[PDB]
Design an enzyme around this catalytic site. Structure first.
Site, short mmCIF file in Angstrom:
data_model
loop_
_atom_site.label_atom_id
_atom_site.label_comp_id
_atom_site.label_asym_id
_atom_site.label_seq_id
_atom_site.Cartn_x
_atom_site.Cartn_y
_atom_site.Cartn_z
N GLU A 1 -88.45 47.35 -12.22
CA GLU A 1 -88.99 46.35 -13.10
C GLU A 1 -88.45 45.57 -14.04
O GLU A 1 -87.75 46.17 -14.89
CB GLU A 1 -90.27 46.94 -13.80
CG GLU A 1 -91.36 46.04 -14.20
CD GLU A 1 -92.39 46.41 -15.08
OE1 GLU A 1 -92.59 47.88 -15.02
OE2 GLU A 1 -93.29 45.98 -15.78
N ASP B 1 -101.38 46.95 -15.68
CA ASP B 1 -100.67 47.41 -16.76
C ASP B 1 -101.16 46.67 -17.94
O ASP B 1 -100.52 45.56 -18.12
CB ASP B 1 -99.13 47.10 -16.61
CG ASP B 1 -98.14 47.79 -17.42
OD1 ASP B 1 -98.35 47.54 -18.65
OD2 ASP B 1 -97.34 48.48 -16.95
N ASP C 1 -99.88 42.52 -23.04
CA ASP C 1 -100.60 43.37 -22.45
C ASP C 1 -102.03 43.54 -22.44
O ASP C 1 -102.80 44.43 -22.79
CB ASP C 1 -100.03 44.84 -22.70
CG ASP C 1 -98.83 45.43 -21.97
OD1 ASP C 1 -97.83 44.81 -22.12
OD2 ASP C 1 -98.90 46.58 -21.50
N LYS D 1 -88.18 42.71 -17.16
CA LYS D 1 -88.67 42.05 -18.33
C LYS D 1 -87.63 40.79 -18.66
O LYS D 1 -86.40 40.91 -18.37
CB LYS D 1 -88.97 42.67 -19.67
CG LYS D 1 -90.30 43.06 -19.94
CD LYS D 1 -90.37 43.23 -21.62
CE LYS D 1 -90.88 44.39 -22.18
NZ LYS D 1 -92.20 44.91 -21.95
N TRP E 1 -88.67 51.16 -15.02
CA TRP E 1 -88.59 50.20 -16.30
C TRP E 1 -87.99 50.65 -17.54
O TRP E 1 -88.40 51.83 -17.93
CB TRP E 1 -90.02 49.56 -16.64
CG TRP E 1 -89.85 48.55 -17.78
CD1 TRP E 1 -89.11 47.21 -17.46
CD2 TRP E 1 -89.87 48.64 -19.05
NE1 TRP E 1 -89.18 46.36 -18.79
CE2 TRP E 1 -89.41 47.44 -19.65
CE3 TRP E 1 -90.17 49.73 -19.95
CZ2 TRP E 1 -89.49 47.26 -21.35
CZ3 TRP E 1 -90.35 49.58 -21.29
CH2 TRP E 1 -89.62 48.34 -21.92
N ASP F 1 -94.33 42.16 -13.03
CA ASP F 1 -95.46 41.89 -13.93
C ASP F 1 -95.57 40.71 -14.51
O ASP F 1 -94.71 40.07 -14.82
CB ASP F 1 -94.93 43.00 -15.39
CG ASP F 1 -95.98 43.13 -16.12
OD1 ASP F 1 -96.49 41.93 -16.52
OD2 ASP F 1 -96.67 44.05 -16.55
N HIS G 1 -97.61 44.80 -11.10
CA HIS G 1 -98.41 45.11 -12.31
C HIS G 1 -99.22 43.88 -12.80
O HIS G 1 -98.38 42.91 -13.38
CB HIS G 1 -97.79 45.56 -13.29
CG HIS G 1 -97.43 47.03 -13.02
ND1 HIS G 1 -96.51 48.11 -13.46
CD2 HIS G 1 -97.67 48.11 -12.00
CE1 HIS G 1 -96.24 49.07 -13.14
NE2 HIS G 1 -97.45 49.22 -12.24
N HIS H 1 -94.16 39.34 -17.69
CA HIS H 1 -92.73 39.53 -18.13
C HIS H 1 -91.60 38.26 -17.54
O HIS H 1 -90.40 38.40 -17.82
CB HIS H 1 -92.31 40.68 -17.27
CG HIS H 1 -92.71 42.05 -17.64
ND1 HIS H 1 -92.04 43.19 -17.57
CD2 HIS H 1 -93.57 42.30 -18.46
CE1 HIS H 1 -92.49 44.14 -18.03
NE2 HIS H 1 -93.69 43.63 -18.60
N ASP I 1 -94.95 39.58 -23.87
CA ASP I 1 -95.65 40.35 -23.00
C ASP I 1 -96.61 41.21 -23.81
O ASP I 1 -96.36 42.29 -24.32
CB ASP I 1 -94.52 41.34 -22.22
CG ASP I 1 -95.36 42.60 -21.58
OD1 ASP I 1 -96.15 42.45 -20.61
OD2 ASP I 1 -94.57 43.70 -21.73
MN LIG Z 1 -95.01 46.58 -16.45
MN LIG Z 2 -95.40 45.31 -19.81
#
Ligand SMILES: [Mn+2]
Ligand SMILES: [Mn+2]
Ligand SMILES: [Mn+2]
Ligand SMILES: [Mn+2]
Lengths: 405, 402
Positions: free
Chosen positions: B210, B310, B280, B212, B169, B243, B270, B246, B278
């Site tokens: 990965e 994640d 988390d 986003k 990523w 993810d 994730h 994302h 995003d």
């Molecule tokens: Mn991630």
């Molecule tokens: Mn992330």
């Protein structure tokens, strides 16, 4: 009045090394594939409230298309669906449609110098009443739709062979569930297997190209559609087919422009359906909007006019239909023109060197450059009405022809 | 005549073998991310209290989280957690030896390790371009970093005799509208082709990439888009990592699982909670998480989808974070295991959309808690909220004497 102005407009653009003469030359030849089903509100000629004056006849719809083409600058194409088969008044099953059944369409396109594109029709049929077709649990039903897409592929081949321009045969299906699936995998497995079989025979790409097309949801099709973005994007890559992207078929805020450049990194050719989503896949007429401009910027910066097959797909039954076509087609032309008239070279360098200030600034300043002047000159040279004057030509045709049906 | 016994009969009436479910759950590993413990600090070269300062504190913190979490699991490590032993090592110069303490600790506790190169907070990342940067020097540095990280993954899997998953990523994109979306993406494609050149046995290392959609400082445009990576991975026999934080508004990763299993052997994901960007957040036992587990379980993919976590909430107890979030994905799995897939598929296959709805819906009040608890017993971790006690004890005597 018109020319001296365009003469002034032309030097404004030329101080950036923007050769407008050249851009007009290139614009003259990009074809726009327009969709038949706007003519008769997806009626079609299969044997078995809204605005007045729709077509109900092959001959009616052909005249309608001629009308709209005459108000739309350039050379274009017409995008056909299988239910537009002219079976001569003898009911023919969709699995049994043949080049024979589109004979007149081809003759007609030849006469007017138009390319023809094709679609199998997988909706409004007993064999699609369950909401599943290519992915239906019943073999006999899948086979019918396999065969029909195959019948469709041959017709695609016929057009390209007849017209000396490849035909794109796009497959769109409505398969999904209104409510929450208890299995997302099995129907999609069945779609791959249905497609493997549909694509079994090579056809020369000089005559036909195949495209697959995703959607996120439809009415009655809300919690899940089988033919999803990830499936078809994977399917197409694996099998060297075309992904067809429809600006109305994605997530909210999800943008087809962002997708063009990645797509061309892995696919040589790309297919486009441009329609205006107003909150669902609603098929409003294309407007000369920001996303449209943006799509155009991508098609041009990326030297992609020959790689991005541009089609239209919308259906507004609440306004004049010939106006629909001409409003919507002119708009995508306008946009191509606009992106033709951007200093990509300097804009690239500024990006390259971190001059984000000039980049923002000039991209913005270009929004007030004298586009109308070029676009209006382009229309004069292309024997189509110049601003809102195509509206007069539509009022006559509505009075004399449309209201009379 | 104990809750569990009674609960077991309820699932039993549906053909569901709860014992079998408990046995296969036991095996499934979750990859816990390291940066939760020291707030993405790392140990390189130079606001709730008592985060970790050092790998020794960090490892000790992880151990405590794992003891509160049933099952045997793994630790997802980031390049900046290199133990450089007092020297400064430039990222394109990282080697296995830099992670031996990590590995030796993993093997002692029987853990797998996953890896990630770190492509942010560094002089040569300050422009928000990395692998896609317009300058060859910059790009090469980061290419070299990734290659190295791949080698370290390799060292990982050889040692722990479970393949390490090394995921790429990168934060590459642009803050405001770009005047070119392609050439940056061409640069990224070239750079990845160079990273992945040397073949590594799949028994020791796996490569993921990965996407986003957007980040802070890059809201307008991300080089490594969903479509860019979906393609790249397909063409080059690599794993996609999804993810759940994302993607676009309303866009779900569960709807993606099944389409992907048709075309790649594996897939990593994730999990994090997005709350409008995003963000988390600690994963919660929510609809979308249930829907993810459902897909993983129904699709016979427990050995096909590598589940990692994640998430980074600096506001709450960092150990409780790992332990809430991880117990959550496991509860989700369990509930997905206790569902009548065969009856429900037969109804969908049949057309009986009524039972499909009724029963999907009825099983939401089934006694999941009684199984969950018995499971947590067998697996030797505290049941219900009891785990907070252990947290609280630990905070007092170690955390809050730093
Ligand atoms: Mn991630
Ligand atoms: Mn992330
Ligand atoms: Mn469409
Ligand atoms: Mn549409």
């Amino acid at each position: 009045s018109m020319k001296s102005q365009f003469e002034r407009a032309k030097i404004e653009y030329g101080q950036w090394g923007i050769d407008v003469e050249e851009a007009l030359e290139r614009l003259k030849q990009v074809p726009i594939s327009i969709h038949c089903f706007q003519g008769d509100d997806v009626g079609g000629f299969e044997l078995s409230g809204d605005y007045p004056g729709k077509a109900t006849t092959p001959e009616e719809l052909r005249m309608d298309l001629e009308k709209a083409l005459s108000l739309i600058p350039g050379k274009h194409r017409v995008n056909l669906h299988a239910i537009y088969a002219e079976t001569d008044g003898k009911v023919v099953e969709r699995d049994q449609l043949e080049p024979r059944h589109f004979e007149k369409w081809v003759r007609w396109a030849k006469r007017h110098g138009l390319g023809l594109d094709f679609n199998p029709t997988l909706f409004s049929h007993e064999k699609a009443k369950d909401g599943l077709t290519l992915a239906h649990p019943d073999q006999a039903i899948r086979q019918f739709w396999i065969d029909h897409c195959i019948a469709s592929r041959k017709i695609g081949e016929y057009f390209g062979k007849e017209l000396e321009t490849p035909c794109l045969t796009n497959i769109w299906i409505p398969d999904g569930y209104k409510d929450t699936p208890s299995d997302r995998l099995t129907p999609r497995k069945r779609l791959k297997e249905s497609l493997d079989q549909i694509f079994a025979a090579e056809i020369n790409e000089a005559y036909n190209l195949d495209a697959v097309e995703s959607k996120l949801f439809g009415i009655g099709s809300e919690s899940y559609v089988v033919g999803s973005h990830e499936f078809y994007l994977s399917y197409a890559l694996k099998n060297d087919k075309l992904c067809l992207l429809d600006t109305g078929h994605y997530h909210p805020t999800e943008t087809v422009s962002n997708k063009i450049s990645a797509m061309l990194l892995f696919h040589d050719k790309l297919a486009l359906h441009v329609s205006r989503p107003v909150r669902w896949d609603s098929d409003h007429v294309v407007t000369f909007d920001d996303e449209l401009r943006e799509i155009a910027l991508e098609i041009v910066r990326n030297d992609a006019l020959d790689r991005v097959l541009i089609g239209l797909d919308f259906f507004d039954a609440s306004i004049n239909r010939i106006a629909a076509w001409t409003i919507g087609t002119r708009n995508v032309i306008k946009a191509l023109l606009f992106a033709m008239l951007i200093p990509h070279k300097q804009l690239k360098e500024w990006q390259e060197t971190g001059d984000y200030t000039r980049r923002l600034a000039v991209l913005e300043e270009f929004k007030t450059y004298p586009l109308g002047a070029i676009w209006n000159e382009y229309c004069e040279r292309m024997n189509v009405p110049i601003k809102e004057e195509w509206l007069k030509e539509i009022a006559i045709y509505e009075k004399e022809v449309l209201l009379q049906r």
